[PDB]
C-alpha cells in the first residue's frame, strides 16, 4: 500500500525570447526622413 | 542639360529609396509586434500549463490517497 | 461522499497574431524593379 | 568625363541597392512565412491542448464517480 | 561647381543608405535569432508535453487497473 | 469490469518552421560594405 506521491514535475527549461529592434526601425525612419536633405537642387 | 538629367534621376531614385525604407520600417515594426505577441503568448501558455499540470497532479495524488484509504 | 465535478477548465485567453506584410514586400519588389527607370543614360 | 564618372557610379549604386531591396524582400517574405506558420502551430497546439485537457478532465470526473460508487 | 554639389549629395545619400542597410541587416539578424529561438521553444514544448501527457495516461491506466482489482 | 486502456494519444501533427535568411543578411552587409566603392571621387 502507501502509493508514493507521483509528482508530474513542472514544465520548465523553456522560454521565448523578445525582439527589441525599435532602435533599428527608428533609425530607418530617421534615414528615410533625412534623405530629403540629400536631394539635389541645382 | 546632362546635369539636369543626373539630378532628376537622382531625385527619383532617392524618392524611391525613401519609399523602400519606409516600407522596410513598417514591415519590421509589424514583425516585431507579432513576434513579441507570440512570445508573450507562448510564455503565458507555459505558465498556465504549469499551473494546470500541477493541479492535475494534485488531484491525482488526492485520488491515490483516497483509494489507498479505500483499501 | 458525492465527490464534486472538479473541472480543469479550458486553456484560453491566449492566441497568436498573424503577420500581413505582403503589401510591404510587394512594394519593395516593385521599387527594385522600378529603379531600372532611374538609371542614367547620358 | 566627370559626368560619365558620376553616371557610372550612380548606376553601380542603384544596381547594388536593387540587389539589397531584393534581398530585404526575400528575407521579409521568409520571416512572414515562418512567423505565420509558427502562429498557426501555437494556435492549433492550444486547440488540441484544450481538447486533450477536457478529455482528461472527463475521464477524471468519471473515475471519481465510479470510485464514489465503490463506496 | 554643380558637379561638386551632385557628388557631395550623392556621397551623403550613399552614406545614409549604407547606415540603413546596416540597420536592416541588424534587425533581420535579431528577428532571425528570436524567431528561431521561439521555434525551438515551441518544438521542445510539444516534445516535453507529449512526454508528460503520456506519463499522465500511463498513471491513469494504472489507476483504472488497480481500481478494477479493487472490484 | 475490465476498464479499457483509455489512451490519451500523442500530441502531434504540429511543428515550428525555422528561418534561414542568413544568406540575405550577409548579402545586405556585403552591399553596405561595397557601396564604398560607389562613392564619387572627382
XYZ file of C-alpha atoms in Angstrom:
339
model
C 0.000 0.000 0.000
C 1.034 3.616 0.654
C 1.186 4.657 -3.001
C 4.035 7.154 -3.499
C 3.347 10.788 -4.285
C 3.932 10.600 -8.047
C 4.750 14.206 -8.948
C 4.388 15.098 -12.618
C 7.102 17.734 -12.303
C 6.951 21.293 -13.570
C 7.179 22.120 -17.263
C 10.288 24.275 -17.412
C 13.647 24.866 -19.015
C 11.910 26.689 -21.874
C 11.220 30.359 -22.594
C 10.632 32.644 -25.554
C 12.950 35.490 -26.437
C 11.780 39.060 -27.059
C 12.817 41.123 -30.083
C 13.925 44.701 -29.458
C 14.733 46.215 -32.844
C 12.960 49.519 -32.232
C 16.301 51.306 -32.402
C 16.806 49.902 -35.892
C 13.298 50.774 -37.053
C 13.648 54.310 -35.721
C 16.992 54.615 -37.491
C 15.436 53.543 -40.788
C 12.634 56.070 -40.407
C 15.148 58.769 -39.483
C 17.158 57.969 -42.614
C 14.040 57.993 -44.780
C 13.285 61.468 -43.451
C 16.913 62.613 -43.725
C 17.292 61.622 -47.385
C 15.231 64.732 -48.133
C 18.341 66.734 -47.238
C 20.242 64.720 -49.864
C 18.023 65.810 -52.752
C 19.827 67.782 -55.443
C 18.793 71.402 -56.058
C 20.854 72.823 -58.916
C 21.375 69.564 -69.597
C 23.141 66.368 -68.623
C 23.377 67.763 -65.099
C 19.615 68.243 -65.023
C 19.178 64.647 -66.171
C 21.556 63.406 -63.470
C 19.774 65.495 -60.846
C 16.308 64.345 -61.902
C 17.289 60.680 -61.973
C 18.986 61.036 -58.586
C 15.954 62.700 -57.017
C 13.677 60.000 -58.415
C 15.978 57.295 -57.063
C 16.118 58.929 -53.632
C 12.337 59.199 -53.529
C 12.007 55.533 -54.414
C 14.581 54.526 -51.797
C 12.727 56.699 -49.284
C 9.566 54.733 -50.019
C 11.513 51.479 -49.735
C 12.956 52.422 -46.346
C 9.520 53.445 -45.095
C 8.159 50.087 -46.246
C 11.006 48.193 -44.581
C 10.463 50.118 -41.348
C 6.744 49.335 -41.387
C 7.389 45.664 -42.124
C 9.956 45.320 -39.358
C 7.554 47.051 -36.987
C 4.776 44.606 -37.767
C 7.103 41.617 -37.452
C 8.389 42.957 -34.141
C 4.856 43.392 -32.830
C 3.718 39.930 -33.877
C 6.839 38.063 -32.773
C 6.635 39.807 -29.414
C 2.947 38.996 -29.044
C 3.536 35.343 -29.894
C 6.449 35.272 -27.462
C 4.207 36.534 -24.677
C 1.592 34.027 -25.819
C 3.936 31.052 -25.585
C 5.239 32.286 -22.242
C 1.804 32.635 -20.681
C 0.852 29.332 -22.294
C 3.616 27.539 -20.458
C 2.758 29.389 -17.259
C -0.906 28.415 -17.323
C 0.187 24.963 -18.461
C 2.416 24.552 -15.431
C -0.488 25.609 -13.245
C -2.893 23.170 -14.877
C -0.438 20.289 -14.806
C 0.233 20.918 -11.139
C -3.482 20.961 -10.404
C -3.887 17.680 -12.260
C -1.006 16.206 -10.284
C -2.591 17.371 -7.048
C -5.973 15.848 -7.756
C -4.237 12.636 -8.750
C -2.208 12.488 -5.519
C -5.585 13.015 -3.904
C -7.241 10.090 -5.594
C -4.353 7.749 -4.869
C -4.607 8.815 -1.232
C -8.350 8.248 -1.152
C -8.142 4.917 -2.962
C -5.458 3.814 -0.521
C -7.880 4.745 2.251
C -10.409 2.574 0.397
C -8.036 -0.361 0.852
C -19.191 11.189 -0.451
C -20.506 12.679 -3.712
C -17.150 13.978 -4.940
C -17.664 17.277 -6.800
C -17.175 17.518 -10.542
C -13.674 19.025 -10.488
C -13.438 20.715 -13.890
C -9.926 21.505 -15.083
C -11.204 24.489 -17.052
C -10.374 25.350 -20.640
C -6.974 26.692 -21.647
C -7.846 30.080 -23.094
C -7.191 33.791 -23.062
C -4.235 33.243 -25.403
C -3.815 33.471 -29.175
C -1.096 34.124 -31.727
C -1.151 37.086 -34.068
C -0.698 36.817 -37.838
C 1.714 38.982 -39.833
C 0.414 40.541 -43.041
C 3.295 42.482 -44.573
C 2.741 41.266 -48.131
C 1.878 44.810 -49.171
C 5.283 45.941 -47.931
C 7.149 43.090 -49.606
C 5.358 43.739 -52.888
C 6.211 47.426 -52.593
C 9.891 46.618 -52.102
C 9.903 44.342 -55.137
C 8.078 46.990 -57.169
C 10.699 49.562 -56.172
C 13.539 47.184 -57.006
C 12.027 46.777 -60.465
C 11.271 50.498 -60.826
C 14.821 51.632 -60.027
C 15.669 50.464 -63.547
C 13.810 53.551 -64.775
C 16.118 55.658 -62.585
C 19.307 54.523 -64.315
C 21.221 57.310 -66.034
C 21.630 57.176 -69.825
C 23.710 60.145 -70.963
C 34.243 62.918 -68.322
C 33.242 63.743 -64.771
C 29.631 63.281 -65.855
C 30.437 59.789 -67.099
C 32.071 59.023 -63.756
C 29.029 60.325 -61.875
C 26.704 58.321 -64.112
C 28.715 55.114 -63.779
C 28.969 55.387 -60.002
C 25.248 56.154 -59.777
C 24.298 53.172 -61.929
C 26.525 50.896 -59.856
C 24.968 52.216 -56.651
C 21.445 51.733 -57.993
C 22.253 48.178 -59.036
C 23.616 47.429 -55.582
C 20.576 48.981 -53.895
C 18.367 46.954 -56.237
C 20.089 43.800 -55.023
C 19.713 44.970 -51.424
C 15.985 45.603 -51.823
C 15.516 42.206 -53.454
C 17.356 40.610 -50.534
C 15.268 42.511 -47.986
C 12.070 41.487 -49.767
C 13.123 37.836 -49.777
C 14.100 37.970 -46.109
C 10.843 39.597 -45.060
C 8.958 37.009 -47.092
C 10.685 34.140 -45.334
C 10.154 35.709 -41.913
C 6.493 36.288 -42.739
C 6.060 32.675 -43.812
C 7.756 31.243 -40.738
C 6.136 33.559 -38.195
C 2.754 32.789 -39.720
C 3.408 29.052 -39.671
C 4.507 29.167 -36.038
C 1.454 31.261 -35.205
C -0.815 28.627 -36.721
C 1.227 26.000 -34.892
C 0.766 27.608 -31.485
C -2.916 28.174 -32.203
C -3.604 24.573 -33.155
C -1.430 23.495 -30.234
C -3.672 25.293 -27.790
C -6.752 23.966 -29.566
C -5.666 20.339 -29.381
C -4.438 21.042 -25.858
C -7.858 22.268 -24.797
C -9.362 19.130 -26.288
C -6.910 16.844 -24.513
C -7.251 18.618 -21.187
C -11.017 18.390 -21.423
C -10.806 14.687 -22.188
C -8.535 14.197 -19.191
C -10.980 16.125 -17.026
C -13.835 13.976 -18.281
C -12.134 10.685 -17.543
C -11.234 12.004 -14.112
C -14.827 13.035 -13.337
C -15.603 9.505 -14.446
C -13.225 7.853 -12.045
C -14.365 9.962 -9.114
C -17.923 8.947 -9.970
C -17.004 5.280 -10.188
C -14.925 5.348 -7.012
C -17.811 7.035 -5.219
C -19.983 4.174 -6.450
C -17.317 1.878 -4.977
C -18.001 3.463 -1.590
C 30.597 73.533 -59.080
C 27.336 71.791 -59.862
C 29.328 68.579 -60.232
C 30.734 69.033 -56.737
C 27.201 69.546 -55.432
C 25.997 66.403 -57.211
C 28.962 64.434 -55.884
C 28.516 65.660 -52.314
C 24.790 64.941 -52.283
C 25.408 61.501 -53.789
C 28.062 60.630 -51.216
C 25.783 61.766 -48.397
C 22.933 59.680 -49.800
C 25.156 56.616 -50.148
C 26.373 57.007 -46.578
C 22.801 57.237 -45.338
C 21.753 54.196 -47.374
C 24.791 52.360 -46.007
C 23.565 53.086 -42.492
C 20.061 51.984 -43.478
C 21.298 48.680 -44.896
C 23.380 48.048 -41.784
C 20.301 48.716 -39.654
C 18.148 46.411 -41.777
C 20.776 43.672 -41.558
C 20.951 44.001 -37.776
C 17.165 43.971 -37.465
C 16.776 40.908 -39.661
C 19.501 39.193 -37.659
C 17.717 39.831 -34.386
C 14.376 38.703 -35.805
C 16.013 35.566 -37.184
C 17.575 34.779 -33.816
C 14.365 35.301 -31.867
C 12.051 33.515 -34.297
C 14.449 30.580 -34.348
C 14.676 30.502 -30.562
C 10.897 30.592 -30.209
C 10.609 27.865 -32.831
C 12.940 25.640 -30.832
C 10.980 26.602 -27.724
C 7.631 25.552 -29.167
C 9.169 22.363 -30.531
C 10.677 21.306 -27.221
C 7.455 22.386 -25.528
C 5.452 19.942 -27.588
C 8.080 17.259 -27.048
C 8.056 17.571 -23.270
C 4.282 17.922 -23.473
C 3.968 14.627 -25.310
C 6.143 13.027 -22.656
C 4.095 14.454 -19.801
C 0.774 13.569 -21.386
C 1.963 10.026 -21.961
C 3.080 9.752 -18.353
C -0.309 11.010 -17.208
C -2.009 8.474 -19.457
C 0.159 5.713 -18.033
C -0.588 6.522 -14.420
C -4.265 6.699 -15.297
C -4.239 3.282 -16.998
C -2.565 2.197 -13.787
C -5.272 3.503 -11.523
C -8.054 2.028 -13.628
C -6.228 -1.296 -13.431
C -5.817 -1.041 -9.676
C -9.396 0.091 -9.105
C -10.600 -2.808 -11.233
C -8.543 -5.059 -8.971
C -10.352 -3.352 -6.082
C -13.625 -4.611 -7.550
C -15.396 -4.617 -15.320
C -12.108 -4.719 -17.261
C -11.911 -0.977 -17.910
C -10.383 -0.361 -21.358
C -6.933 1.142 -21.737
C -8.028 4.718 -22.474
C -5.014 6.158 -24.298
C -4.828 9.944 -24.414
C -2.968 9.808 -27.721
C 0.175 11.705 -28.624
C 0.145 15.438 -29.291
C 1.354 15.622 -32.873
C 0.726 16.917 -36.356
C 2.309 20.236 -35.358
C 5.807 21.680 -35.740
C 7.512 25.051 -35.979
C 9.429 26.167 -39.033
C 12.974 27.549 -38.923
C 14.041 30.760 -40.664
C 17.266 30.672 -42.667
C 17.798 34.162 -44.060
C 21.499 34.361 -43.223
C 22.298 34.473 -46.928
C 20.129 37.573 -47.241
C 21.614 39.260 -44.180
C 25.137 38.557 -45.401
C 24.210 39.965 -48.802
C 22.921 43.169 -47.213
C 26.103 43.567 -45.190
C 28.199 42.870 -48.287
C 26.289 45.557 -50.185
C 26.668 48.029 -47.328
C 30.416 47.443 -47.472
C 30.514 47.509 -51.285
C 28.733 50.865 -51.599
C 32.047 52.389 -50.512
C 33.325 51.526 -53.992
C 30.400 53.514 -55.425
C 31.408 56.782 -53.766
C 32.260 59.565 -56.199
C 35.819 60.936 -56.232
C 36.051 63.754 -58.770
